[PDB]
Every structure is written in C-alpha cells, then in structure tokens.
Write a protein that binds this DNA or RNA. Structure first.
Ligand SMILES: OC[C@H]1O[C@@](CO)(O[C@H]2O[C@H](CO)[C@@H](O)[C@H](O)[C@H]2O)[C@@H](O)[C@@H]1O
Ligand SMILES: *P(=O)(O)OC[C@H]1O[C@@H](n2cc(C)c(=O)[nH]c2=O)C[C@@H]1N=[N+]=[N-]
Ligand SMILES: [Mg+2]
Ligand SMILES: [Mg+2]
Ligand SMILES: [Mg+2]
Ligand SMILES: [Mg+2]
Lengths: 553, 416
DNA sequence: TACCCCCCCTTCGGTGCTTTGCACCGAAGGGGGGG
C-alpha cells in the first residue's frame, strides 16, 4: 500500500493551449506492439481511457529498448513542450568513476519503469492526450491520457529526478554510512559494511522504494562485479570503460569521421595520448554528411597511433581523499595537449586532452595556461579541489611570460617536469631602443576600392624600399612593411610603425598563426638577436614615419 | 506578524536564470551546513524544478576571518528588480562620508533575516547547491526572508534601520552613517581610540535591538581623507633621445583627448629627419616652451567633469608590472572622475589574479564611499582566467559588474 | 518525426575596436557518452 508521490504543479505558457497534432501513419508491425503496450499501461493505471471530451492529440511512436526484446512507447510532445512552462534542470553534471572512493561492498540497481511510477499533475493530464489507430486506420482507435510522467515531455526528466531525490532524502539521512549515486533512475550503492549488512540495507532500500511505487526489478539488480554503470565497468580496485568500437571502414564519409572523432574523444578520458587534430581537420569544410573523404597521410598516421593506444587495455583507479591530486601535461604538437590526473605513479585516476585553438595568433604558453584552466575546473567538478600541476615549462620561462604580459595571468602551485618538448618563448622584444641598430620606419597602405597596395620603409642610413601589392588590405600591408624591415635588416634592428593592429599581434609573442604572413614574421623574429618595436601616431609628421607615409600612399 | 512589502520586477523582464557554477569541497560543505541551519529557522525552504529561476551561490571568508559566509550572486536579480528610487525607498548618499578621518564598515546583513519577504517575489531568489562529482541532483532552495546581497533588502529594511540608529545618531550627531547593501559605513573625525569606541558602542546598541525586536563583531577601517589621486605626468629629462621624444609625442597626443589645449607641433618638428632612435637631440627653444606649457595644462583639472547621479560609473584597470596597477573611474569617456594607482597589494609578484581581485574590491569600496555606487569594471584579463580563480580571493559581500578587455599598452600613459 | 544533462570540433553571425577589416565569442549542429 504505497504512499503516493505528491504531484508537481505544472502550467502551460500564459495564453497558450494544448497540442492538436494528428497521428502520422504507423507501419503495421508497430501498430500491434503499440496496442499491447497500451493495454498493459491501462491495466496498471498508467494511462486513463477517457477520450470524448478532450480535443487534444499528440503523435506516438515505438522503439525497442537497448539490447532488449521489448518495445517502448515514445510520445512526440515538442508542441506541448513549446507550450509548457520552462523548468530548471536539477541534473548539473555527470558522475565520473574517478571521483568514487573504494567501497568494500557495492550494488547497482535500476528503478523499473521510472516515468510511469510518478503521478503527473492532475490538471495537466488532459494535455498529454493521444490517439492510437486500433488496426491501421481501419476503425477509429482509442483516445488516452497519461496518469504519470510521459516519455517525450520536456518536463518529465526534471520532475522524476526531483521526486526521486525527495524519496531518497530520508533514507540517506538515516543511513549516514551509505553512499548513493543517483543518476535519474540508476542508483549506485556502496558501503564499507559486511556484505550481509550490505544486502540488508539494499533490501531496505528496495522496500522504501517499493513503498513509493518505485520498483527495482531483479533483472536490473547487479550484485556481482564487474558492475555496469554509466557506460563503465566497476571492479573493486580499478575501473574502466565499456569496449570502444572503432569503425575500420576503408571508405569514410563526413559522418564516419564525425562518429570516429567523437568516439576518440570519449576514449581520451582514460586512454592517454589520444589525438584528433588531423582527423578533425578532415572534417573542416562545407562537405555534407554523405560525401566520401580520403584520409590525409598525416591524418591516417594519427589514426594509427590511436589504434596503438587502444590496443592495450587501460584501467583507472579510485580516489583517496587523503592523497594529493597530481596533474601532468605533455605537449603533443600543433596545439595538442594531453594530461593525466593521478595520486600515485602510473595509477592514473583519469586522463584527457586539450586541443582547443582559440585566437588567430597564439603561443604555447597561452595554450598551456588554458589547459591548466580546463584541468583545474574538471578537477573541482570531480573532486572539489585543485590538483598540484607538473608542467613541461621552466620556472624562468613562466616568470618571464606572466610578469611581462599585459593581461593578468596565473597558474596555481606547480613544478617543472623535465619532459620534452618543453614550452618556451621563441623570441623577446627589447625594452629599450638598440644603440647602433638600423632604424626602419615602416608603413603600408591599400586602396579600399582597387584592393591594391604598397608596403615599404625608410632607414636612418638612407636605405629604402617600396613593394607593390595586390588583393590586400590596410592591415595586411602594415604587417607586410614590418616583414620587409625584418627581411632586410641585420641581426639587430629598431622598427617604428604606426599600426596598432600590427603591434598588438606581435607584442603578444605569438609562435603560431592562422595567417601565413604572421607565421613568416614569427620565423624572422626567431632568427633575430634583438628587435625593438615602437609605435608612433600616424599623420603627426614624425620621423621617417611621415616620409614613408608618402611613399606608400 | 510583519506585513510584507510587495516587490515587482521591472516591466518586461523575466527573473534570473543563471546556472550554478562548480564549487570546491570546502565551499560545498560550508553551504550545506549554512543552508541546513537556515532551513531549520525558516529563512529558506526547499523547492522543485517547476520554479524556472536560479541565481548562483558560493561562499567566502572575509579579510582575516576564519568563518565561512554564504554569498549569493544576485547581480542578475538586482538588475531585474524594480529600482526603489522610483518607490522613494532608496537611501540618499552623504557627501561628508568621504571627508571623515576614519570610516568603519560593519556587516549588518544578519538583521535582514528578521523581515518576511513578499510571497509572490520569493520564487525569484531560487538557488541550487551542487554536489561533488554530481552524486546528487542539485538541491534548490528559495528565500522566505529578506536575503543578504539583494538590493531590495536594505531598501525594505531602511525603516527599521533608521529607527534603530536614531538614539546613537542623536547622542553623537557628528558621526556619518551610510547604508550600502549588507554593510554599514560609519565615519567620524574622532581620534582612532574614540572612533573604535563609538563603533563598539554601536555594536552593542545593535545587539540590544537584536535581543528584543559574517558576524557583527568584525569591522574594517578606511581613511578616505588620505586617498591620493594619480594624475598624468610627463617625464623629466635633460637629454632626450629620438625614442624619448616619439614616446613623449605619442603620450601627449593621447592626452589631448582629455586636455584639448595640448599641442605637439614644436615637439613633432624635432622629429623631421629619419634619425636613429638612439640619437640625442637638443630641445629647441620653441619645444621647451611647448613642453612647459603642457605640464601646466596637465596640472590643472579637466574642464566640465562632474558626477551625474543618473549615469553609471565605469572603471578601467591596467596592469603596469612589478605589482603596480592603475585605474580610472569615469561616466563619460575622457571625463575621468578619479584616477589612481595601487602597489604592493596581497599577491604581488606571485598572483596577478589575486592582485586584480583586491584592486577591484578596493576600487568598488572607494566608489561606494565617494558616490554610493559600484562601477562596472573593464578587467585586463581573459574571461576563462578570471572566472576560474576570482572566487578564491573574493572577500567582499557585494559583487560588481564586469567585462573583459585586451588592450595592448602602446603608450605608457598612466605609468612612466 | 520524442525528452533532459555533460563533453569536443566546426561553422556562422553578432559585436566592437584592430574599423568598414579583423578578431573574438557564443550559439547551434555535427559527433561521442549517460538515463
Ligand atoms: O563573469 C561574467 C559571467 O558571469 C555570468 C554568470 O555568472 O553572469 C554574471 O556576471 C555578469 C557580469 O557582471 C553579470 O552581468 C550577470 O548579471 C551575472 O549573472 C555570465 O553571464 C558571464 O559570462
Ligand atoms: P534508464 O535507461 O533506465 O531510463 C530511465 C528513464 O529515462 C527516460 N528515457 C530514457 C531513454 C534511453 C530515452 O531515450 N528517452 C527517455 O525519456 C525514460 C526512462 N523511464 N521510463 N519508462
Ligand atoms: Mg530504468
Ligand atoms: Mg536506468
Ligand atoms: Mg600605417
Ligand atoms: Mg600611413
């Protein structure tokens, strides 16, 4: 005799009315399994029969459970969804195995028919109305309404999830030496109790749950490891992922590469060193999902290195709140970084990758800081604390970077790990003008209409150059003039520009750029011994700046 | 049996829907304990997913304090809640506070939990406590009483607050008292001993109402009278290189947007040839006068710059290196109400983000005392960097608005 | 012909100073995963 779950008051969006979308034609095979599933629900009380008085209908369909013999009813509620009040979702993140502590005794059980065990709001029920063709549009069919949370309604997850928590609330408080991880209907239950007292507590849990109309079928009651949970396999002293299936197809479309790259992403959480840059590059373009795409030489080298990683079987360990967290990062080239989080050597809690390329012009130091930032946040999500970092960068390098950079930047407690390739700054601009170095006053201009331009410079020794440029812009020519100065100067050079655009880019010491010309300037800067950049306002008749402004205008 | 003051959001605005951000273990523990105690006392109550609103919450320790303090980021709710100036509830600002020799800041937010909040408005104060590794879905509460950190709470409490302070004020009529959010600013010209004494009197005075009709004991001591201003200054040299004069001319040409009478003709002439940056060049007689005239112009205050109570305050901060930070507060571009510089703050030479956090807190405090407003900050830092670390260093019970900028320093304008 | 959450990579349009080009950023749509 259950104590029924109090309803959740749910309204429609002000001044909108229920759904009126008629059922699309249903293929025969579905119509039958559909009718039998309906009648079951009708016997159970999950759906009420009334249909003369309610004008509303929503289309229904049916799909099989995952790896199961059974047929599952789905309601297309997107119209109701638009008309229903917004909800605030209480599912904030996904539990991760590496956040679990080790438990002597563990159980994994699932609530059976979750949504259909929680009574819908009385007044809202009429809007869930739907119609099923009795026998392939031979006879009218029967109208029905939901008595519980229906699959397909945008408010069903939030309401079930919140109800589930209110039911579990007193059981946790009055058993403070149990740990229950609830994800929707899936419960993980761990204790350091004797498996006897554990099985008892479990049985107490199912009763309490059955007491609120929530069944826990035996078919979903895991008692022996490896526990299947959230797509992982939990053993008593180690965890791992459920097998990854890599498409080995010789012909790849767009969609094949997307699926492939996605799966590798999912593998990167425990398989160290996964790289997706080359594969992802293949994806970049207007190519539609169907078009077939040949793998680049370097792209299938990546896939091969990936296979070599997925060859071995990796496992993660669990978390010991008494040991520090440690994060170690390696540079993998071309803006790719992987890391490991662990507490004891070679026993990785988990791994991951950071490869986001943000900005047209950046350097490794910026990218490492971003990787540190992602890892700090991921760590606070899973363990609620910042790990000690081990980074491939000299203390001196970091100090020189962050103290001279014009934005505030920082990295929490860390130490140098001497693991090549090390991160370093590839050049450094002088703080003061260089005595005895040639001063190049550069400028560049383009014609807004012609897209034709010039770049050049004048020098304190009389040296001069002007170059005609086609299909260009002001900003390109400004970079070009700096390029010319660097090409034509000795190992030490003073350069005076009026390009705020150009000085902005170069002063952030980029080491890689999406622009070939910027890359060319970087290459010149690395070869130099001393470079001093200085800005002057344009059109104020300064220096050779007014003398070079008239050359290229 | 207190009747609730009705409250409405600004017409044509929904409540806040801001996602809760991840919390460290120690912060989640503090919030769970604090919310448990608050729930037993009716201050908050449990809610479900059918309330569509949310406001982020976290926890802080004030300066030199060991006890956690709940902090709600009500910035969104505050900007969606009816301005109480129209209601006439809003607090007036005393021009004399900034003139006092000592100003003490008192946390009085606790008081606000005594007053019921309008039933129809409660839904807008929803927050979600998160859990480590997402063991549990979020636990949503809403407020039943006036919440700390909401701009409505001092407004609605003003009546009770004025009645409470009335005796102390009449006894000591020279002391200025200003209420901003959860804080009380108490300024006096007394000697420090008698000042702290009067603050202690006020503390016990507040308890006597507390007994009859985060903690109160803490107190921070400002000295607004000694707040320096950092103006624009030109270097002084006997010998100028071409580089120096190019820098000087670029600086002066930027300044001309602030002081229009500034001229660079005579100085620019000295740069006619194509000369080595390093060459020393004697200043011409004309150039020396021009430079001297510009120092004079920079010495006087800008014309037509004043505080408009209807316009927002904006603050810009530049990182100058070596633990030095410069800032300007203005309402209209190039009409700076105040300029300044900080050095040797907590975190100098090891943590830019802590330094900047202190800077932001210092500037906001100055703006409250001087104008009774908090500026919107342009922060010299990447968004991701700021958002990752700032709550580790936040020690104030308010949070200013901010945005992120990336402005390479082409002229060393506010620092030589 | 369905619903809610998280993640990465790409594209694309809105926004503001580097200005009418270019850089940045968030949204949305592809994929992975969970229920
Ligand atoms: O750091 C800004 C960041 O915070 C968010 C979410 O918490 O919004 C908050 O901060 C804004 C900046 O001041 C406020 O305007 C806003 O009201 C407040 O909720 C994000 O929107 C924003 O990216
Ligand atoms: P778990 O697999 O056991 O499912 C629990 C509840 O989640 C809802 N659901 C699941 C899937 C896979 C889906 O595609 N759409 C959903 O709405 C329904 C299910 N409860 N029931 N009955
Ligand atoms: Mg289930
Ligand atoms: Mg389940
Ligand atoms: Mg130019
Ligand atoms: Mg020019």
């Amino acid at each position: 005799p259950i104590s029924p779950i109090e309803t959740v008051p749910v309204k429609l969006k002000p001044g909108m009315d229920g759904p009126k979308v008629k059922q699309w034609p249903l293929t025969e095979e579905k119509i039958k399994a559909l009718v039998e599933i309906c009648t079951e629900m009708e016997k159970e009380g999950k759906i009420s029969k009334i249909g003369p008085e309610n004008p509303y209908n929503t289309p229904v369909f049916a799909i099989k459970k995952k790896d199961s013999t059974k047929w599952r009813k789905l309601v297309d509620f997107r119209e109701l969804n638009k008309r229903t009040q917004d909800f605030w979702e209480v599912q904030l993140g996904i539990p991760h195995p590496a956040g679990l502590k080790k438990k002597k005794s563990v159980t994994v059980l699932d609530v059976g028919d979750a949504y259909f065990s929680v009574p819908l709001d009385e007044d809202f029920r009429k809007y869930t109305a739907f119609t099923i063709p009795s026998i392939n549009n031979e006879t009218p069919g029967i109208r029905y309404q939901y008595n519980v949370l229906p699959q397909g309604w945008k408010g069903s997850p939030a309401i079930f999830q919140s109800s589930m928590t209110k039911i579990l609330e007193p059981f946790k408080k009055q058993n403070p030496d149990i740990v229950i991880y609830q994800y929707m209907d899936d419960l993980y239950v761990g204790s350091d109790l004797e498996i006897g007292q554990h099985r008892t507590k479990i049985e107490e849990l199912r009763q309490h749950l059955l007491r609120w109309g929530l069944t826990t079928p035996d078919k979903k009651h895991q008692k022996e490891p490896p526990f299947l949970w959230m797509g992982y396999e939990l053993h008593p002293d180690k965890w791992t992922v459920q097998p990854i299936v890599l498409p080995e197809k010789d012909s790849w479309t767009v969609n094949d590469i997307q699926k492939l790259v996605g799966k590798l992403n999912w593998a990167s959480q425990i398989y160290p060193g996964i790289k997706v840059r080359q594969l992802s590059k293949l994806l970049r373009g207007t190519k539609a999902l169907t078009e077939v795409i040949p793998l680049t030489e370097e792209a299938e080298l990546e896939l091969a290195e990936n296979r070599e990683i997925l060859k071995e079987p990796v496992h993660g360990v669990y978390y010991d709140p008494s040991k520090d967290l440690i994060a170690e990062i390696q540079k993998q080239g071309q803006g790719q970084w992987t890391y490991q989080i662990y507490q004891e050597p070679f026993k990785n809690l988990k791994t991951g990758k950071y490869a986001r390329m943000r900005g047209a012009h950046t350097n490794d130091v910026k990218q490492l800081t971003e990787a540190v930032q992602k890892i700090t946040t991921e760590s606070i999500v899973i363990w609620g604390k910042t790990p000690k970092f081990k980074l491939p960068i000299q203390k001196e390098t970091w100090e020189t970077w962050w103290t001279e950079y014009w934005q505030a930047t920082w990295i929490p407690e860390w130490e140098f790990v001497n693991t090549p390739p090390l991160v370093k700054l590839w050049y450094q601009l002088e703080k003061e003008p260089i005595v005895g170095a040639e001063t190049f006053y550069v400028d560049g201009a383009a014609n807004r209409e012609t897209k034709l331009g010039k770049a050049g410079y004048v020098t304190n020794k009389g040296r001069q150059k002007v170059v005609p440029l086609t299909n260009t812009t002001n900003q390109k020519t400004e970079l070009q003039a700096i390029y010319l100065a660097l090409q034509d100067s000795g190992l030490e050079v003073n350069i005076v520009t009026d390009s705020q655009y150009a000085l902005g880019i170069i002063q952030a010491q980029p080491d890689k750029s999406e622009s070939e010309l910027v890359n060319q300037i970087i290459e010149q800067l690395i070869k130099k011994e001393k470079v001093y950049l200085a800005w002057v306002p344009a059109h104020k008749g300064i220096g050779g700046n007014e003398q070079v402004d008239k050359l290229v205008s | 049996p207190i009747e609730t003051v009705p409250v409405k959001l600004k017409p044509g605005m929904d409540g806040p829907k801001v996602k809760q951000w991840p919390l460290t273990e120690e912060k989640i523990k503090a919030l769970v304990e604090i919310c448990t105690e608050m729930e037993k006392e009716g201050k908050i109550s449990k809610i479900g997913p059918e309330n569509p609103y949310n406001t982020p919450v976290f926890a802080i320790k004030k300066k030199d304090s060991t006890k956690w303090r709940k902090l709600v980021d009500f910035r969104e709710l505050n900007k969606r809640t009816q301005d109480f100036w129209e209601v006439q509830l809003g607090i007036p600002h005393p021009a004399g506070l900034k003139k006092k020799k000592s100003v003490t800041v008192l946390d009085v937010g606790d008081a606000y939990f005594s007053v019921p909040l309008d039933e129809d408005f409660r839904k807008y104060t929803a927050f979600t406590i998160p859990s480590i590794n997402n063991e549990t879905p979020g636990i949503r509460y809403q407020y039943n009483v006036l919440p700390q950190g909401w701009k409505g709470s001092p407004a609605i409490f003003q009546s009770s607050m004025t009645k409470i302070l009335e005796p102390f004020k009449k006894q000591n009529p020279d002391i200025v008292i200003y209420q901003y959010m959860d804080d009380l600013y108490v300024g006096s010209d007394l000697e420090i001993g008698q000042h702290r004494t009067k603050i202690e009197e006020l503390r016990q005075h507040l308890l006597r109402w507390g007994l009859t009709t985060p903690f109160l004991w803490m107190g921070y001591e400002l000295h607004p009278d000694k707040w320096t201003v950092q103006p624009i200054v030109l270097p002084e040299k006997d010998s100028w290189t071409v580089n120096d004069i190019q820098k000087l001319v670029g600086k002066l040409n930027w300044a001309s947007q602030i002081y229009p009478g500034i001229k660079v003709r005579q100085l620019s002439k000295l740069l006619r040839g194509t000369k080595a940056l390093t060459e020393v060049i004697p200043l011409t007689e004309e150039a020396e006068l021009e430079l001297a005239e510009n120092r004079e112009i920079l010495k006087e205050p800008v014309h037509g710059v004043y505080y408009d109570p209807s316009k927002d305050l904006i603050a810009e901060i530049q990182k100058q290196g070596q633990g030095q930070w410069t800032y300007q507060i203005y309402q209209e571009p190039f009409k700076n109400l105040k300029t300044g510089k900080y050095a040797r703050m907590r975190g100098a030479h090891t943590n830019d983000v802590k330094q900047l956090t202190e800077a932001v807190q210092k500037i906001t405090t100055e703006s409250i005392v001087i104008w009774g407003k908090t500026p919107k900050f342009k922060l010299p830092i990447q968004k991701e960097t700021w958002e990752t670390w700032w709550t580790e260093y936040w020690q104030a019970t308010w949070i200013p608005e901010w945005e992120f900028v990336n402005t390479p320093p082409l002229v060393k304008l506010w620092y030589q």
